[PDB]
Amino acid sequence: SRVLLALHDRAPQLKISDDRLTVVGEKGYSMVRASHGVRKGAWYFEITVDEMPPDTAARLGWSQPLGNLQAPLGYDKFSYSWRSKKGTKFHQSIGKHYSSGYGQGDVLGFYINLPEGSSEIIFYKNGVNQGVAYKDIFEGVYFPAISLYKSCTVSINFGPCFKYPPKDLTYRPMSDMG
Amino acid sequence: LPMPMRFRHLKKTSKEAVGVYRSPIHGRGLFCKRNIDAGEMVIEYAGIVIRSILTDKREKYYDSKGIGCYMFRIDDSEVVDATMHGNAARFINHSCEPNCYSRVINIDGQKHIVIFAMRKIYRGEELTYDYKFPIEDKLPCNCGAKKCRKFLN
């Protein structure tokens, strides 16, 4: 059925709402993946930062199944992330300059393209392209992925309707996987 | 007694019940200064509680500084790192015929490693437990017991 935050594929310390679309962090960085992942084509989803108290943060993006649930997204070779703090992008624990930061009330967009042509990961802030973050990524299945540092709160939207659908970007909503 | 009561009594009394002295097994050991009944808490293996994922980072750091690493795993998810902050429990030697055992207890949502007495232990005895090291390819054991397994690993 519908795409949701995964039932078991999640760090146990994260507090997931009953509807499985909202999650709150707990102490050190930890991660939850969606219930469905994609292998080919172009796909999109959104995450809204509901609340970002002082000294809390998020690293949001895409993860293969082996991505470590007890580490920030982007920690290892299995995922790619975008940090709320300073807009840094992370992969294999290397943080690089990417965009400006994002915070409470921001609606972030997450694009991936896996041609059956080069693979790409692109991040959006309230509908606006923040630039290509990663290109020619590792082959595999990628799941929408949330990692949180301390008690900030985010909500994921897999579609079909997005808050800020990007202009001239073709994709299927992650909800199509449902 | 509710575990948090037993645990409170432990923390309030362990300093006067045990002490560090030279050991005939090895180096310095932990010793009983007053009789302890079977099943009673002896001492906590105290230190900094870290997530399991942080052990590798810390081990490599300590290794680079030539520092002996003192970690006690709680479970798959957490470890007590007593390398830089800890207590006298660090001095408890291994024995192949120990008089204590370690168990994990839960207090107010936090896990603690506590050493318990296997039997009634008398004043002056050295306190020991089985380290349960996995078998390597070796650290000679000097516990002195007739049933000594000759190596810790």
């Binding site: 000294d55 992370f90 | 800890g86 207590n87 660090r90």
Partner: peptide
């Protein structure tokens, strides 16, 4: 070491895992 009387839960930083 440094003596402690009770366990301390390590307080990880945001950058705990970063290079």
């Amino acid at each position: 070491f440094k003596e402690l009387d009770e366990n301390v839960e390590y307080e990880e930083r945001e950058s705990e895992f970063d290079i």
